[PDB]
């Protein structure tokens, strides 16, 4: 079993250092690893550790930046983060190199830590700012909440009332580090110019509460 | 440098598929130690390949692995539900670091294949007025979900200030996913028309929208 900690969210040039506790096996007789996993994409190696510490192998990315490191006498891997950019956002867990007789590294990662998160961005908390989305006998329409900072915010429309045909998107992160998520309702074309279509956006951190009239 | 695996595969149950890893003779065709890893939503990955060839205690033997040149290859007999999910294949290089495919999502069939609903919104009028404009590109109802999506200004590429989501999960049991476009109000006056074009599962579908 192995444990990640020492994360968290942090501005791009901050530092942070993470720590994996092991156990349950001999530490200072193994090799170990660092990797990490940007959301929503691939896994990704970062740095190696030779089990006693006399040599260390970093990745492109990450060089020369993050610097592995560990403590025979604590049983602990250590990573060490310096001028931190927004690439390095992404899950870091702490994986054990198999190994044993005629250790001998086998070359395959048998132990993972259940990861710890690093979120490096420059955004503040911020309210969103809301847009409509216009429609053009089956109508789409919906809001645009762009530039929200952090996650969540919940949008209704009509209050609750019309919950038929609304499809709420996933946000995407934007390289500024604000959030931005679409809405949308499929409406009867008849409707439009009789009907009123209200989306209600609510955003707990910030306390902002916004609501926007669509219309053709 | 990843190694280069396909963005997907898919299957339906019973039926044998495989996936490729195809490195440098530096560090895939230069050594025996290929491995290869399964990963479930929000779980952390697990061997199912080493040596190239080799089980781990406890691995179905529906899981088999081959090397030929720079490409090695993953291959799973009989797809059962529980197979699916993303795998990735790690390398040794000439330089004793360690290297990941770029990864394979693997969907082992429920439905039949279904093609995406795509919806283009031109930049709201709100926004333009605030010195912004953004496009939305929604695509819903398709499976697997796995989508390239692309952008076209006029018949010319874009590939400046693009962001698009992971394909999410509908209560529908199909995906949904979404690629927005910044640009200056500028930009979006001066070009004749804006494209989407998502390409899945070989297809290519395509909406446009003009001032």
């Known amino acids: 079993r192995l444990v990640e900690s020492g994360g968290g969210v942090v501005q791009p040039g901050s530092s942070l250092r993470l720590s994996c506790a092991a156990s349950?096996?001999?530490?200072?007789?193994?090799?170990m690893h660092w990797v990490r996993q940007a959301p929503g994409q691939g896994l990704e190696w970062v740095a190696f550790?030779?089990?006693?510490?006399?040599?260390?192998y970093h990745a492109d990315s990450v060089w020369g930046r993050l610097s592995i490191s560990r403590d025979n006498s604590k049983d602990t891997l250590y990573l060490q983060m310096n001028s931190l950019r927004v690439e390095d956002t992404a899950t870091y867990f702490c994986?054990?190199?198999?190994?044993?007789?005629?250790?001998?590294?086998?070359?395959?990662?048998?132990?993972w830590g259940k990861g710890t998160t690093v979120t490096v961005s420059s955004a503040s908390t911020k309210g969103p700012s809301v847009f409509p989305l216009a429609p053009s006998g089956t109508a789409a329409l919906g809001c645009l909440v762009k530039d929200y900072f952090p996650e969540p915010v919940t949008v209704s429309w009509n209050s609750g009332a019309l919950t038929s045909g609304v499809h709420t998107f996933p946000a995407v992160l934007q390289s500024s580090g604000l959030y931005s998520l679409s809405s949308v309702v499929t409406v009867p074309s008849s409707s439009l110019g009789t009907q009123t279509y209200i989306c209600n956006v609510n955003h707990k951190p910030s306390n902002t509460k916004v609501d926007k009239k669509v219309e053709p | 440098s990843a190694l280069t695996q396909p963005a997907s595969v898919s299957g339906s149950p019973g039926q044998s598929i495989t996936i490729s890893c195809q490195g440098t003779?530096?560090?895939?065709?230069?050594?025996?130690?290929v491995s290869w890893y399964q990963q479930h939503p929000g779980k952390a990955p697990k061997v199912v390949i080493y040596?190239?060839?080799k089980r781990p205690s406890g691995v179905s033997n529906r899981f088999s692995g081959s090397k030929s040149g720079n490409t090695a290859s993953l291959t799973i007999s009989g797809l059962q539900a529980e197979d699916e999910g993303d795998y990735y294949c790690?390398?040794?290089?000439?330089?004793?670091?360690?290297?990941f495919g770029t990864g394979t999502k693997l969907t082992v069939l429920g439905q039949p294949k279904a093609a995406p609903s795509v919806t283009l919104f031109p930049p709201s009028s709100e926004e333009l007025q605030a010195n912004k404009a953004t496009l939305v590109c929604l695509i819903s109802d398709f499976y697997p979900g796995a989508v390239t999506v692309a952008w076209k200004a006029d018949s010319s590429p874009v590939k400046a200030g693009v962001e698009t989501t992971t394909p999410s999960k509908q209560s529908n049991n199909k995906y949904a996913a979404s690629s927005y476009l910044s640009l200056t109000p500028e930009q979006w006056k001066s070009h004749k028309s804006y494209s989407c074009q998502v390409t899945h599962e070989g297809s290519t579908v395509e909406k446009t929208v003009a001032p």
């Open positions: 994986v054990r190199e198999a190994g044993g007789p005629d250790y001998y590294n086998y070359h395959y990662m048998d132990v």
């Open positions: 349950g096996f001999d530490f200072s007789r193994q090799g």
């Open positions: 550790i030779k089990y006693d510490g006399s040599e260390k």
């Open positions: 003779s530096n560090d895939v065709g230069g050594y025996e130690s």
């Open positions: 040596d190239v060839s």
């Open positions: 790690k390398s040794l290089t000439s330089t004793r670091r360690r290297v």
